Write a protein that binds this ligand. Sequence first.
Ligand SMILES: [Co+2]
Ligand SMILES: [Co+2]
Lengths: 69, 79, 94, 279, 81, 83, 104, 77
Amino acid sequence: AILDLAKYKDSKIRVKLMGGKLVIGVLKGYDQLMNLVLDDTVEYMSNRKLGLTVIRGTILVSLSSAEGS
Amino acid sequence: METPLDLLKLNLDERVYIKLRGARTLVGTLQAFDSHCNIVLSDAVETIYQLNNEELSESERRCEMVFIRGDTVTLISTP
Amino acid sequence: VDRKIFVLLRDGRMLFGVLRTFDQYANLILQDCVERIYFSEENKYAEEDRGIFMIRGENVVMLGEVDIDKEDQPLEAMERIPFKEAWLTKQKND
Amino acid sequence: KSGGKKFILELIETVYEEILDLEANLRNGQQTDSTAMWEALHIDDSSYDVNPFISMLSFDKGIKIMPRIFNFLDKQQKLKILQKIFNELSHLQIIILSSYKTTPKPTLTQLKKVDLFQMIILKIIVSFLSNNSNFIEIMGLLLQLIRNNNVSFLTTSKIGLNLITILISRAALIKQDSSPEISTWNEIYDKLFTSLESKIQLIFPPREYNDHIMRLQNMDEAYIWQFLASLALKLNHQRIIIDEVRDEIFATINEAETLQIIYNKEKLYQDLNLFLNVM
Amino acid sequence: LPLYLLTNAKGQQMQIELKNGEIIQGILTNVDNWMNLTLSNVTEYSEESAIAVKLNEIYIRGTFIKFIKLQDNIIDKVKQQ
Amino acid sequence: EILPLEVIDKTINQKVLIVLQSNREFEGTLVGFDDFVNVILEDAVEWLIDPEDESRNEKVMQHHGRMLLSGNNIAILVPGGKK
Amino acid sequence: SENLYFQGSGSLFFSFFKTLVDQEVVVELKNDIEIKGTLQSVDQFLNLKLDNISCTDEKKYPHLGSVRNIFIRGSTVRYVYLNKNMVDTNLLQDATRREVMTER
Amino acid sequence: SVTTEFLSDIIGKTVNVKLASGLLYSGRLESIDGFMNVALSSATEHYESNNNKLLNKFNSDVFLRGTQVMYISEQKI
Ligand SMILES: [Co+2]
Ligand SMILES: [Co+2]
């Protein structure tokens, strides 16, 4: 694909989602389709930490590094 | 027992009721449809439900022949 | 397929420009775009320039060829107001 | 619709399917697979309170698909269907709607549906009884209508009353040459009259009815007079008819209580004149 | 075809708006067949703020872009005039 | 190598919390899923969520039996169930 | 026995609109905009190009005097209004039943 | 194939089908098009909960768009 995700392993993950949601956490794993496994995850309120999650790639709208985690 | 479309095909030449997402409902006599739920109605009367300044109001239109794009359709049943 | 057109988008904003490489899905690439906002109720309007615009096809509602010059003169008798005012007004209107 | 109307819609769409292939088999195919379509009409099947064909004959698309379905049919199948219509004629949900007795105020739509069944099914029955009939089979059809229904109930229905007119008229229109048949006809004719004899002029519709229809458009009663002319054309018989309807003739002739829009008074006189010219 | 054209506009800075009104302004570093973007020097904000956070880098999924404004081609603009 | 469907696989018959794109989530025991990530939950609790006040989140139904949640709208899957 | 409202499995409304080409229709969009015009073509996604339009001005609407022809993205249409003369309703139901016959 | 197996053995049971509009329809499930179009007989309509105002009751079969189905669940209670 286009972005090699190996580089962010156990690095802060900041993740925007289709419905307005934003999620941050450390990368643990992935699939070819950018389904993601995140640990230590905090989700953001748009008009809160639960830690462990699995995010659907289909719903991903943007991803970047965060100083936050 | 057939897929829901077949039941819809059972209604051809009959009065059908169609519900749209945007607070609009139609009732009329069905003439055609595809699997995308695009529809041709032959003597329909549309009715629109609104929110005006804390009161519910309903204006309505009728027309002889109208194609109606399926992706707006939320439900179908008999008048 | 090198024409000057207007486009109205799903969010309600109007873009104007000259098209290229468009319509396989109707996805469009425009040059020298202009976003124009009208309020006929106050004889005002507003502009801001858009150089090269790429548009994803699910966001276009409709488009069509225009003659810019014929549409200008009406432009003339109206007061161009600041773009900022129009954006704030528009959110008020919508 | 004693059945579900889920059921009858199934049926009516199955017949629509089957006749859609049989028509589609004209790119060459073994065309007469009508043995597969007929079984869907349930004509033979007396497994219900009302025969499923008579039921789907109530729906609009049923009546609309009758000319096409008759195309792939074989007289004695065509005759089997026409016998089914007559034998259960009082079960037709469009006999009900033409009757003023049962459906006193019929929505404009229901008036329309009556007009449709009229234009399509009568054409079929008037045609089949012209280019495809035996005198004795006309006897059979007629006799069937009599023995299985509350005759004169039907005389209130535009459809039934018109139907009766068709049976009789086409029958008596066999004045051409070429015995016991003649003997049989007398017997039926006498048998029909009795039921009507007391109840003729129950035919003519109540005033409110006419008022309700009249409000929905513009009453053409030419179908009533055409009937009375048909039944007349049995001398004492002629007397009884001209008796119970006399005052209605006296009222209708008095009906022309107006002389001098360009109102079409010609129409009303023509109907009664069509009766009297006949007999 | 659109992806192909953008891939020639590769390496230049631009201001891209997403489907939800977020604006991402940055330097395009790579593009793919699915209209994926690298976004090498990024600043991210809303239309409300433009008319507010920098992170140096962002990854964006192609199917979620509403539109993208690219910078005026200097030679093409002068040729037009 | 940990793969998302495999982590999720390891959650079958455990409590799981399923969050949509909108402000809605369903907690219940996860029975199974497919390729299109349609998820089956058993005896699911349905919540609406207030972004601002955990007190004003609203519990809309306790479901009983199995329910199928269409994978169109699934945003987030949480193994262990929203402790 | 093949009719005009019927070309193949998944092209029903496409053939239906192709039947309405060169006829005057009115198209209403999901955002309430109504456009009167003459149909010049359709595609498999039912996008419409209307020639020689006439219109009802609008709150959100700025009117471009030079515009005679518009392209319309199919996915943004709510209604396409017609007159009963333009369509054989028996045939439109028939070809529909044939398609359902096939599509199952 | 757990999902296809689920629709099989729920034909005939009473269910709750909530659409994306948040509207909730209950009655008996007999179609499961697999685009998840649903047909239901005896369908009632509530806004989000069985506890709310009945908005519409249907006396014949209802057809529901698969593209709009959010969930389907048995109404055991
Ligand atoms: Co009179
Ligand atoms: Co409307």
